[PDB]
Design a protein around this ligand. Structure first.
Ligand SMILES: [Zn+2]
Ligand SMILES: [Zn+2]
Ligand SMILES: [Zn+2]
Ligand SMILES: [Zn+2]
Ligand SMILES: [Zn+2]
Lengths: 77, 384, 31, 116, 183, 322, 340, 79
């Protein structure tokens, strides 16, 4: 069960990594600060890192208790 | 052995299929509102239109303001008493029409707002002028999002629909075209349009709808038409959460078989936005690509078509999918970065064109859709 | 009048004989 | 001609739209007089009581959390108040050659108690 | 206590009528190809020659005429469901349009006569009628009922309105449904 | 056999009875002699010719030919008088719908008022550039020369009083010279105040949308935790393998004489995922407190030894990868 | 309040603004007026934290829009009355009796009253009108009954029946009990409508709208494997056509095929083996394809119809055994006996 | 409606503890109103006291404090 759940993440890891890395935000939202600020405030954003490795690190933090369940779910979603 | 599980191919336009596109928009349509707590909002029309203007799509098409329909022209399908009641009822004199309120199903689930007659006139005029421009050859694609009221019937208002403008448009198409195919990708069944053209072979009404205990309840697979209209009303019952690949692998074979079997001369395409994921009343899981793939696939046949926008009760998603569908009819693919419009605050948090599908269960199994498409294909053998 | 809605008590073998009889009748009258 | 509307619906079909041994009366009653008099537990189910306090305090100040011991203090106090008032009512009844407390018997008690 | 021995075939016909009106939402074709007078006249012309007693002939004609008068005076009161009262209203307005009073004898079919027969014992028990008249009226109604079994295939037929225009029942419209059961 | 059921429906009933038995249903299919209309459907019924005759003034001969007026359907008839089942939506979806509802309210009111301001300012700039001798008898038609006849009426009836809105509309129709500029000024003031309130509300709507939207689009994930608690148990995992075995044994007696020697099939194409699960398990061992440290270390080499022994991975590779 | 201040010659001078504050603060859908913005009480949970360019191309449309009128059809082509009707026992718009606490539907009366052509002054019911007619006349009720019997000498036996129904208020026709008790399957609905064995028990609102998000009566929004397992036996519900139960695995829930049971013989069917998309939660009871029909149409080559006889209670139902075994023309209404 | 949560059998239990053998039926709904108005007196004072401490939560100490004011002291919950 764990290996299937992680294999679903890893088999699509390259396309979700390329999608997150090539996330071109629109201009009027940057000029009028309409985007989410907190999203990256907690560093949840999977930018600059491999998506599957960031999933592993986030799940390790969630297991260790330093990460809330809701923020982990929000970052994954 | 009819249904094939195929992944959703990316949307590609055909450069050899350039169409003269006519756009029908009356700036007033949006200033009408069903109610305070009501899901249907004509305001979705003008934020869709604001996305057309701000994408610079008006340089590849002609924008028209159709003349609003008069009383009689509405009576080409509806009765005199129903149009007379619609043109006279207001929220003020609702107590003066109580028998007609329950007779014509107006007052609950189809409320009386004081711009009702004008809204219906705009919708019917847009549909009829799009059909007329298709008849004279002035355009190849007629776009009218002001209408789409496919639930309205001869003497009643149902499903937030009062004037069945699609029947008026198909009537105007039938004066110059022998066979008109109506395609309904709205999540609800096109009961008004199918009921109107149930007994005729001149109009084939195809509806891709959710059929459960869902509105309007009509739309069983065995509903194939009676009399001379037998096997000329294709109903495709679907379950919840159909995704883009599943909807494509259902839609494209059925519409292709209708194209090479029924051979229509004009196409009416109901682009209900309630087939999108995240709709207030809809229960499908279509992204904007999945919704627009039907419009792009029906565009490939070259038949003079009338794109008419129907449902859609979350305004942002239906506006974005109508803008993408309209851009697809000009043989361009709009970039997934929304321009600045006056309603830019709706499309958060990413402010992009895309409508993201939900991660809910695609319960439409391949065996069920295989049986559905097998019976549909078997019924279509008599339409040559 | 309770005799109008009398339910016939039939058996499996009689149904078998009747079905065979009537299919043979139909097949050979059309033949 | 007086008329009234009751359907309250402008249109019909709203649902199809898109939007054996038996004791004598009183013996069991006296038995559980004895049961609820020898007992000390709290007779108004708690949750329901707590709620009574939330919807009624709301008026004096919104967002007023209540220490648990508090809603238990309100219960105790309320049950003590009502058992005292009900002893008095039974008296205000046994006064009028009767054995059935009635509303009037308690609109009076409270007048003599002076709580009105 | 007054009892009526209605045959279970006619009881099932009445129950099917209740099904068609309330559940299937079907009204009767009015005027029918066979009305109520037409049944109370053919029954009189059939059992008039069945015996040679002139007092019995007078009693039979008395029963038929009284049943006709009772049908006309009571159909608007208590003989038709809430769905058919709209059809009754349009019949009354159509009769008033051409200035002829509406008589239910020549309009309504034999199923409403069967309804009157079925509801008849409650009406008998609600009036100060002596035992002899009640017994003889029940006997005459029972004889008419057992006459109806011999002609149950020509007055109460089974036909789908969706397939035959000559069915005894018709399908209704949504506007009729709204006006009948919405106000 | 009673000359009641037709051969076609008998063949259909036997097909529903003996469909999977292909050999038997063929014996019958032919033992019987079946050789391969009026299908109305369940959701349409035919009106009589009396209900068809209703006046539609706009219909010509073609309209009377191609339009169906006898066969009708209704949602109440298709519901069997019971009703319909709406699709269940999350509370995040409901509050997203409420945000959209408030957005629509503000935008509908503001844009209707702006359209009325545009029409009134056209009237005002028309009436400013003419003298006063004919300004007294200058009137305005219904609709104020606009394509709508009701939008300005809605705006006036909202902005002013309920009883005074009608008389202001009549004063604008009769004497627009005095009533037009004051109405335009009041509408512009209401427009700017509504727009300031709409911007202040737009901030709140945007922040709640950012808080709500991705949870709203999550359907299975909103209930995945209780579903995983309920369904990743011993009983359900036994039920899956037992159901697959029951299916195989049920279909064994019909066909597929080489009965398979397996029920569940698991594919393991990637080997790094084993190291990832081992790292997650090691993290849980390090974090937890309900297990003793000897029990912790025995859990560690038990997991490592089972992974190294079951699969092709060596212990050296596991140690060098974790 | 003197809106238009006309002059002595009738010329307009200046008008006064009416009460804007009369409805300037109406509650909108936001819960606050459109005049004001959001309050802090709702700003706390809406905002993430609370502390104590004009290049528009949307104005060019009016200019780029050309009217369109090229269609072929252009130009021209006391006491409170009840709240339930006294005749049908159903709610709706009523005409209230003045000197009587009963209320009647506008269509339920004899003759039915138009909802626009009402009685101008007072309206009494039939029972009330008979009461005023009796009280106005000096003679008693039995005197008028005897006079009506003697005057209507043509019919004697129905005369007492004719007299008493003028006093009865009009009521909706209902079948008497002895027509309904002979068929035990036939029931009566809440509105007096027909109901029988082919009708579901209506689902309460606790089941439809008072359920959790993931769990719905539709059984389509989540993977529910506790539907292939029989509740009272614990075995697997094997579908009749495919001879399998596709329970799924919760790691591939798309491999699970939905299964329902028949509402009559409890035969479990997959949703794909019989072509169905719904689960038949409310309305009529779902019938599996294996059951014999109670109504069939056959072609004459007009047509002929056959309906199965309704179920009759044991005191009035006769089961008889044929003497003739072969060729006995039964009406299609039969019973199967065990073969010995 | 939270008031109708004070159910009949509960009012019957209070009467039984109060020694009543036959409760009228109209008592039940009189005892609600009397109950409410009384709680609506304590809790009022309970909160005046609460918003004097600038506390937003109420305490059982404030409850017995409001009872002391009304007159009916309550022992067993502090103070
Ligand atoms: Zn729709
Ligand atoms: Zn009265
Ligand atoms: Zn009534
Ligand atoms: Zn199956
Ligand atoms: Zn079954």
């Amino acid at each position: 069960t764990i290996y299937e759940r992680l294999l679903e993440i890893k088999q699509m890891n390259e396309r979700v990594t390329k999608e997150i890395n090539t996330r071109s935000t629109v201009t009027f939202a940057k000029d009028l600060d309409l985007l989410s600020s907190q999203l990256s405030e907690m560093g949840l954003d999977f930018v600059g890192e491999d998506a599957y490795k960031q999933v592993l690190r986030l799940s390790r933090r969630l297991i260790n208790g330093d990460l809330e369940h809701q923020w982990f779910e929000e970052s994954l979603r | 052995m009819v249904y094939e599980a195929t992944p959703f191919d990316p949307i590609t336009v055909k450069p050899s299929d350039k169409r003269r596109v006519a756009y029908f928009y009356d700036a007033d349509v949006g200033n009408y509102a069903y109610g305070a707590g009501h899901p249907m909002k004509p305001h979705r029309i003008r934020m869709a239109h604001s996305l057309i203007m701000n994408y610079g799509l008006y340089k590849k098409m002609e924008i028209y303001r159709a003349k609003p329909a008069t009383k009689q022209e509405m009576c080409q399908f509806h009765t005199d008493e129903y149009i007379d009641f619609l043109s006279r009822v207001t929220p003020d004199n609702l107590e003066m029409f109580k028998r007609e309120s329950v007779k014509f199903n107006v007052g609950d689930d189809c409320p009386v707002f004081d711009g009702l007659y004008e809204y219906c006139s705009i919708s019917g005029g847009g549909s009829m002028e799009g059909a007329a421009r298709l008849n004279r050859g002035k355009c190849d694609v007629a776009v009218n999002y002001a209408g789409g009221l496919h639930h309205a019937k001869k003497s009643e208002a149902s499903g937030f629909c009062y004037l069945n403008d699609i029947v008026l448009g198909i009537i105007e198409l039938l004066r110059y075209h022998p066979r008109v195919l109506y395609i309904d990708i709205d999540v609800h069944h096109g009961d008004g349009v199918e009921e109107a053209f149930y007994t005729t072979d001149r109009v084939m009404t195809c509806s891709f709808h959710k059929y459960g205990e869902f509105f309007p309840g009509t739309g069983e697979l065995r509903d194939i038409g009676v009399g001379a209209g037998k096997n000329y009303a294709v109903n495709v019952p679907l379950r919840d959460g159909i995704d883009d690949a599943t909807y494509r692998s259902v839609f494209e074979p059925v519409i292709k078989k209708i194209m090479e079997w029924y051979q229509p001369s004009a196409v009416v395409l109901q682009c209900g936005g309630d087939s999108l994921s995240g709709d207030r009343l809809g229960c499908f899981n279509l992204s904007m690509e999945g919704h627009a793939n039907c419009v792009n696939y029906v565009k490939s046949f070259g038949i003079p078509m009338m794109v008419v926008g129907g449902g859609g009760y979350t305004m942002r998603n239906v506006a974005r999918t109508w803008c993408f569908e309209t851009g697809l009819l000009n043989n361009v693919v709009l970039d997934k970065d929304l321009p600045y419009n006056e309603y830019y605050e709706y499309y958060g948090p990413d402010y992009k064109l895309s409508v993201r599908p939900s991660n809910m269960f695609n319960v439409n199994t391949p065996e069920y859709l295989d049986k559905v498409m097998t019976n549909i294909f078997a019924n279509l053998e008599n339409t040559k | 009048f309770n005799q109008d809605f009398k339910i016939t008590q039939i058996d499996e073998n009689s149904i078998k004989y009747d079905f065979f009889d009537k299919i043979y009748k139909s097949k050979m009258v059309q033949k | 001609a007086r008329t009234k509307q009751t359907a309250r619906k402008s249109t019909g079909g709203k649902a199809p739209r898109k939007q054996p041994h038996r004791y004598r009366p009183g013996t069991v009653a006296l038995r559980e007089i004895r049961r609820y008099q020898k007992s000390t537990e709290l007779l108004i189910r708690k949750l329901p009581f707590q709620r009574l306090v939330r919807e009624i305090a709301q008026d004096f100040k919104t967002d007023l959390r209540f220490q648990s011991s508090a809603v238990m203090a309100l219960q105790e106090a309320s049950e003590a108040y009502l058992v005292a008032l009900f002893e008095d009512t039974n008296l205000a009844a046994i006064h009028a050659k009767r054995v059935t407390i009635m509303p009037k018997d308690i609109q009076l008690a409270r007048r003599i108690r002076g709580e009105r | 206590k007054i009892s009526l021995q209605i045959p279970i075939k006619l009881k099932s016909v009445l129950v099917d009528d209740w099904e068609y009106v309330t559940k299937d939402k079907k009204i009767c074709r009015l005027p029918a190809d066979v009305t109520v007078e037409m049944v109370l006249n053919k029954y009189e012309h059939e059992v008039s020659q069945e015996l040679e007693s002139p007092g019995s002939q007078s009693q039979l004609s008395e029963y038929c005429a009284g049943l006709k008068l009772y049908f006309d005076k009571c159909l608007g009161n208590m003989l038709l469901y809430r769905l058919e009262r709209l059809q009754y209203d349009e019949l009354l307005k159509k009769s008033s349009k051409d200035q002829k009073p509406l008589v239910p004898i020549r309009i309504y079919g034999a199923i409403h006569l069967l309804r009157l027969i079925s509801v008849l014992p409650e009406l008998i028990s609600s009036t100060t009628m002596d035992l002899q008249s009640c017994q003889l009226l029940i006997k005459q109604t029972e004889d008419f009922l057992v006459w109806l079994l011999m002609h149950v295939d020509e007055y109460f037929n089974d036909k789908d309105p969706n397939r035959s225009d000559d069915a005894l029942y018709v399908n209704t419209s949504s506007q009729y449904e709204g006006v009948a059961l919405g106000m | 056999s009673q000359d009641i059921l037709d051969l076609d429906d008998l063949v259909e009933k036997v097909d529903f009875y003996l469909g999977s038995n292909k050999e038997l249903f063929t014996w019958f299919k032919n033992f019987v002699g079946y050789q391969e209309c009026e299908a109305f459907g369940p959701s349409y019924k035919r009106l009589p010719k009396s209900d068809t005759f209703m006046p539609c003034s706009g219909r010509d001969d073609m309209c009377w030919e191609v339009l169906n007026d006898e066969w009708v359907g209704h949602p109440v008839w298709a519901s069997e008088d019971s009703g319909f089942i709406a699709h269940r939506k999350n509370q995040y979806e409901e509050t997203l719908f409420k945000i959209e509802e408030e957005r629509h309210e503000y935008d509908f009111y503001i844009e209707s008022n702006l359209r009325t301001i545009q029409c009134l300012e056209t009237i005002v700039n028309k009436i400013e550039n003419m003298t006063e001798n004919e300004k007294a008898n200058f009137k305005l038609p219904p609709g104020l020369g606009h394509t709508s006849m009701t939008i300005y009426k809605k705006v006036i009836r909202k902005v002013y009083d309920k009883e005074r809105g009608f008389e202001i509309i009549d004063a604008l129709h009769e004497h627009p010279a005095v009533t037009a500029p004051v109405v335009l000024k009041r509408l512009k003031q209401k427009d700017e105040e509504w727009r300031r309130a709409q911007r202040e509300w737009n901030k709140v709507w945007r922040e709640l949308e950012q808080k709500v939207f991705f949870k709203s689009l999550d359907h299975l994930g909103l209930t995945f935790k209780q579903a995983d608690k309920k369904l990743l148990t011993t009983k359900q995992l036994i039920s899956e393998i037992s159901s697959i075995k029951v299916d195989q044994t049920n279909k064994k007696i019909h066909w597929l004489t080489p009965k398979p020697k397996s029920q569940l099939d698991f594919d393991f194409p990637d080997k790094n995922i084993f190291y990832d699960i081992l790292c997650l398990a090691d993290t849980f061992i390090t974090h937890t407190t309900a297990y003793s440290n000897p029990d912790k270390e025995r859990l560690k080499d038990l997991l490592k030894y089972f992974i190294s022994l079951f699969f092709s991975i060596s212990f050296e590779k596991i140690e060098e990868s974790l | 309040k003197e809106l238009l201040e006309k002059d002595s010659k009738g010329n307009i001078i200046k008008l006064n603004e009416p009460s804007t504050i009369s409805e300037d603060s109406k509650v909108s859908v936001t819960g606050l007026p459109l005049n004001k913005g959001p309050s802090e009480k709702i700003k706390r949970e809406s905002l993430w934290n609370y502390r104590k360019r004009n290049d528009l191309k949307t104005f060019l449309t009016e200019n780029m829009t050309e009217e369109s009128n090229i269609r072929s059809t252009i130009g021209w082509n006391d006491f409170e009355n009840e709240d339930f009707c006294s005749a049908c026992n159903q709610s709706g718009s009523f005409l209230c009796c003045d000197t009587c606490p009963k209320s009647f539907h506008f269509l339920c009366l004899d003759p039915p009253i138009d909802p626009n052509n009402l009685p101008k002054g007072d309206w009494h019911c039939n029972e009330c009108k008979f009461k005023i007619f009796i009280n106005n006349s000096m003679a008693t009720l039995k005197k008028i009954e005897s006079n009506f019997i003697k005057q209507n000498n043509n019919v004697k036996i129905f005369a007492k029946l004719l007299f008493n129904i003028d006093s009865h208020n009009p009521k909706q026709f209902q079948l008497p009990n002895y027509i309904k008790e002979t068929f035990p399957a036939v029931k009566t609905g809440s509105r007096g409508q027909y109901s029988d064995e082919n009708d579901k028990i209506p689902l309460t609102d606790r089941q439809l709208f008072n359920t959790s998000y993931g769990q719905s009566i539709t059984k389509l929004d989540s993977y529910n494997p506790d539907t292939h397992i029989d509740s009272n036996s614990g075995k697997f519900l094997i579908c009749y056509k495919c001879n399998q139960t596709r329970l799924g695995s919760w790691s591939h829930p798309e491999n699970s095929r939905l299964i329902m049971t028949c509402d009559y013989c409890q035969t479990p069917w997959h949703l794909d083996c019989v072509p169905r998309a719904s689960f038949k939660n409310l309305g009529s009871k779902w019938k599996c394809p294996l059951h014999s029909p109670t109504k069939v149409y056959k072609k004459i080559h007009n047509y002929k119809v056959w309906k199965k006889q309704r179920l009759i209670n044991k005191k009035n139902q006769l089961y008889y055994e044929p003497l003739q075994k072969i060729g006995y023309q039964n009406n299609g209404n039969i019973q199967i006996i065990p073969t010995t | 409606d939270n008031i109708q949560g004070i159910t009949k059998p509960a009012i019957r239990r209070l009467a039984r503890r109060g020694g009543v053998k036959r409760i009228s039926g109209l008592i039940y709904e009189e005892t609600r109103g009397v109950l409410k108005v009384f709680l609506e007196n304590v809790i009022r004072d309970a909160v005046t006291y609460t918003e004097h401490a600038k506390r937003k939560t109420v305490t059982a100490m404030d409850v017995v404090y409001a009872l002391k004011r009304q007159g009916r002291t309550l022992y067993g919950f502090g103070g």
